[PDB]
């Protein structure tokens, strides 16, 4: 069906995160330049490229997550450990969560309980927050640096936690004394976790693989190979059928979930640093370590 990625728009330091809002109407970027920039997708695609909002931050940014119910709200995690909820219309920080003691690598707003958000940190803690409360609601003390956290798309009771210990820890937040399951397979730190569906979890790792897992029956499914990822956070994004990730060769890779080697790749000293599908469509946002953003589309 698809053999290539077409470039349909290009906006010319490291972009750590690129994400669409609840309606795939706006998208935001953030990274080491200490600024969250919000763009209008249709304007980017139609025009020959200025953000509609910019919010300056105290610290380098590692991750963004838009709220799934409040259109205008977006969370960020930063290198000081601060997890911030922002309103892109007023530009104000609504909440500043400061309990983490080191860099927070990841933040995720729940889709099904949209006031809930989870973060993970080099301080080896996972923290769950509610936008109506200043103090964390849940704290999980883990043994190693947490690189990524993601809520299950169907229920706010489950999170996947990718750890520097090479494992994915899958928690039921109703009983955090032990994880539901810990998935071993990766040979290096797990840098991203993303769900394709309620029962299908994907991961990326600096062992140069993506992996697919079944979180209903707790099974390994598939390992994906072709890209180069031994060092950096290079991005992972999934939808119902496809996985895309960056590479330290400055190439974006796309896999179909049933096929272990790439369906296609796109050549952008540089590494791809962030990727995001436009929901279940063949359109994708991408960004690299030079700060360039491209809108790509899978095509015949």
């Amino acid at each position: 069906r698809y053999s290539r990625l077409r470039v349909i728009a290009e906006i010319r330091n490291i972009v750590s995160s690129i994400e669409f809002d609840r309606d795939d109407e706006l998208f935001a970027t953030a990274g080491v330049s200490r600024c969250i920039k919000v763009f209008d997708f249709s304007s980017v695609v139609n025009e020959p490229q200025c953000p509609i909002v910019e919010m300056s931050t105290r610290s380098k940014l590692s991750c963004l997550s838009w709220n799934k119910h409040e259109k205008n709200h977006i969370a960020s995690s930063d290198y000081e450990g601060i997890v911030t909820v922002w309103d892109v219309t007023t530009r104000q920080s609504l909440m500043e969560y400061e309990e983490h003691e080191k860099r927070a690598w990841s933040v995720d707003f729940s889709r099904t309980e949209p006031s809930m958000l989870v973060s993970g940190s080099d301080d080896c803690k996972v923290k769950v927050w509610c936008t109506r409360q200043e103090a964390s609601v849940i704290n999980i003390d883990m043994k190693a640096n947490i690189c990524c956290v993601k809520y299950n798309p169907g229920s706010s009771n489950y999170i996947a936690v990718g750890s520097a210990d090479h494992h994915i820890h899958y928690y039921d937040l109703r009983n955090i004394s032990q994880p539901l399951h810990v998935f071993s397979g990766h040979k290096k730190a797990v840098s991203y976790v993303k769900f394709l569906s309620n029962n299908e979890l994907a991961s990326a790792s600096t062992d140069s693989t993506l992996r697919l897992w079944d979180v209903k029956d707790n099974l390994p499914v598939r390992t994906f190979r072709g890209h180069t990822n031994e060092k950096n956070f290079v991005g992972l994004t999934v939808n119902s059928e496809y996985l895309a990730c960056g590479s330290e060769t400055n190439e974006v890779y796309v896999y179909h979930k049933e096929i272990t080697r790439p369906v296609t790749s796109h050549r952008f000293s540089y590494f791809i640093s962030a990727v995001c599908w436009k929901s279940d469509s063949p359109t994708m946002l991408t960004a690299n370590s030079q700060g360039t953003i491209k809108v790509l589309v899978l095509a015949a």
């Binding site: 330091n13 730190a189 840098s191 600096t206 060092k231 950096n232 956070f233 370590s289």
Partner: peptide, 7 residues
């Protein structure tokens, strides 16, 4: 160095 996965 930035955006490096902890090891």
């Amino acid at each position: 160095e930035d955006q490096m996965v902890p090891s």
